[PDB]
């Protein structure tokens, strides 16, 4: 279910899109490759979408919308820090 998706999953997905591989994403995020692989698989399950064959067309759109969500999650953090 889409309701099961968490922030960690979204960050891992974004890193794979940005860097072009699971191992490059792991390096960028300071995570273990196993964690990236598992997170992406779980995201595909939750969305019931194939995200990688190289990204699918659906992954390209999801990347754009996720980037916006993450910006707003970080705007929340800025507000929370300022209180």
Binding site for its own copies (CB under 8 A): 1-8, 11, 17-20, 24, 47, 49, 58, 60-69, 71-81, 83
Token pair listed for 67: 């980037």
- The C-alpha atoms of residue 20 and residue 43 are separated, in whole angstroms, by 17
Closest separation between CB of residue 27 and its own copies, Å? 11
Closest separation between CB of residue 22 and its own copies, Å? 15
Question: 43-53 as b/e, with b when 16 or more CB fall inside 10 Å?
Answer: bbeebeeebee
DSSP-H helix ranges across 1-82: 7-19, 22-29, 33-47, 57-82
Closest separation between CB of residue 70 and its own copies, Å? 8
């Amino acid at each position: 279910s889409v309701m099961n998706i968490n922030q960690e999953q979204l960050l891992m997905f974004q890193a794979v899109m940005e860097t072009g591989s699971f191992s490059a994403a792991a390096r960028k995020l300071g995570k273990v490759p196993s964690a990236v692989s598992m997170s992406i698989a779980n995201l595909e399950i939750d969305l019931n979408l194939t995200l990688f064959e190289t990204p699918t067309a659906e992954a390209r759109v999801l990347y754009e919308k996720t980037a916006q969500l993450l910006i707003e999650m970080n705007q929340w953090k800025q507000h929370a820090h300022a209180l």
